[PDB]
Design an enzyme around this catalytic site. Structure first.
Site, short mmCIF file in Angstrom:
data_model
loop_
_atom_site.label_atom_id
_atom_site.label_comp_id
_atom_site.label_asym_id
_atom_site.label_seq_id
_atom_site.Cartn_x
_atom_site.Cartn_y
_atom_site.Cartn_z
N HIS A 57 10.99 9.23 2.44
CA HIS A 57 12.21 8.57 2.10
C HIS A 57 12.51 8.55 0.58
CE1 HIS A 57 10.09 4.58 1.10
NE2 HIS A 57 9.24 5.59 0.91
N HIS A 72 15.02 7.32 -4.66
CA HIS A 72 14.45 6.53 -3.60
C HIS A 72 15.55 5.98 -2.65
CE1 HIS A 72 11.99 4.13 -1.22
NE2 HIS A 72 10.93 3.98 -2.02
O1 LIG Z 1 7.41 3.94 -0.82
P1 LIG Z 1 7.72 2.86 -1.79
O2 LIG Z 1 7.54 3.09 -3.24
O3 LIG Z 1 8.21 1.55 -1.30
#
Ligand SMILES: O=[P-]([O-])[O-]
Lengths: 149, 249
Positions: A57, A72
């Protein structure tokens, strides 16, 4: 001058308006957010993919121009454990602007994700002379979102 | 017959490392006015250490994992230096004549306590990261010994009741042949790390650490979800034949 191209379609939003103090406080770097309206995340620059989250993701890419970016999708999206995302590219892949990295299911995420707001940040802040934030609606792999010097 | 949730399938053979931590002792004794100025200095002097030691951990996360883990430490460090904590920690000591370890604990516990009132599992985990910052602060003022997972000179398996994000950064991935813990299940980014790292590991053991001593030889099936403690050579030979079948499969 380096132009960062929109990694997804949507509307530009202030990074300070993202419901996450780590991003809002730019601890992770500075940049913009996008309220997504499409189905895919592409390379915002010519460079090499660095890291793809195991939940497929979020990812890291370094441009050839030496800028480090970090896209992100959504907020707290890791909690969905990969649901709604499909890794299309590979870590270490060389890419050109517009190359598909990941495809996602918007409606599913709109329903399940805390937020679909998508930060696009520069993780290299100390190496850049200036960051000029753009405004408006963007179209994946076409519309510039940031200009850097 | 011990079973956990198995976060990553695979197999491994190595020694078992046990993380032991002494309980932190808090003094409920009240201080006098002359001790008010001294307790603040102790807090500043103790805070002075964690300031530099926390910064050292940050640099290891950036080189070890990357910028994704480096900035998390900056948030924890930036939150710790929050001007609200400086005035609130000093005010209680100066106003309530309380100790720095007891007064400081209330400030970090007070905020984390407010976060727990939240009815969300995602907000509750972050409250765990904030709680960890104050927990180590008490050790930093007292100056308690820290094992440091970076001092590993030999390959070993990592066994603990639960690991905090801070340990995962200063953790030696090459010298740890796997991760085993009795945490809740998903845990913060830990159990998640086994998935992304693609290394065999369990997080729901429940009570394996109480059955293992450091330097114990253990074999992780991560396939039959079983752990063998000090197995004879004949048992390993039998387990090796099965591993060959898996490779062929
Ligand atoms: O996968 P993440 O940095 O919440």
């Amino acid at each position: 001058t380096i132009e960062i191209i929109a990694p997804l379609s949507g509307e530009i939003v202030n990074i300070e308006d993202v419901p996450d103090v780590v991003f809002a406080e730019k601890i992770v770097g500075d940049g913009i957010a996008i309220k997504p309206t499409g189905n895919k995340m592409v390379a915002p620059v010519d460079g090499t993919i660095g890291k793809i989250f195991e939940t497929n993701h979020a990812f890291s890419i370094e441009s050839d121009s030496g800028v480090e970016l970090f896209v992100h999708f959504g907020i707290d999206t890791v909690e969905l454990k990969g649901e709604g995302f499909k890794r299309i590219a590979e870590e270490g892949q060389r890419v050109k602007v517009g190359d598909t990295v990941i495809e996602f299911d918007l409606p599913l995420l709109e329903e399940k994700a805390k937020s679909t707001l998508t930060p696009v940040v520069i993780s290299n802040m100390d190496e850049i002379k200036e960051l000029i934030k753009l405004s408006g609606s963007v179209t994946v792999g076409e519309t510039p979102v940031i200009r850097i010097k | 017959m011990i079973s956990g949730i198995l976060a990553s399938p695979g197999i491994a053979f190595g020694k078992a490392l046990l993380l032991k931590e002494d309980e932190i002792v808090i003094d409920r004794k009240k201080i006098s006015a002359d001790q008010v100025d001294q307790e603040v200095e102790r807090f500043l002097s103790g805070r002075a250490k964690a300031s530099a030691q926390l910064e050292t951990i940050k640099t290891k996360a950036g080189e070890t994992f990357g910028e994704e883990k480096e900035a998390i430490f900056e948030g924890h460090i930036m939150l710790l230096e929050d001007e609200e904590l400086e005035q609130e920690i000093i005010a209680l000591i100066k106003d309530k004549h309380m100790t720095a370890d007891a007064a400081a604990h209330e400030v970090i516990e007070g905020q984390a306590s407010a976060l727990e009132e939240l009815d969300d599992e995602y907000l509750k985990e972050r409250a765990a990261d904030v709680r960890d910052i104050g927990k180590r602060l008490l050790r930093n003022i007292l100056g308690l010994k820290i094992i440091d997972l970076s001092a590993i000179q030999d390959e070993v398996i990592l066994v603990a009741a639960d690991l905090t994000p801070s340990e995962t950064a200063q953790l030696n991935l090459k010298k740890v042949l796997g991760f085993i813990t009795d945490a809740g299940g998903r845990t913060s980014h830990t159990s998640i790390m086994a998935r992304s790292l693609e290394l065999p590991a369990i997080v729901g053991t429940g009570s394996v650490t109480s059955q293992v001593k450091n330097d114990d030889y253990l074999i992780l099936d991560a396939v039959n979800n079983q752990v063998y403690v000090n197995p004879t050579n004949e048992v390993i030979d039998k387990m090796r034949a099965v591993q060959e079948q898996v490779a062929s499969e």
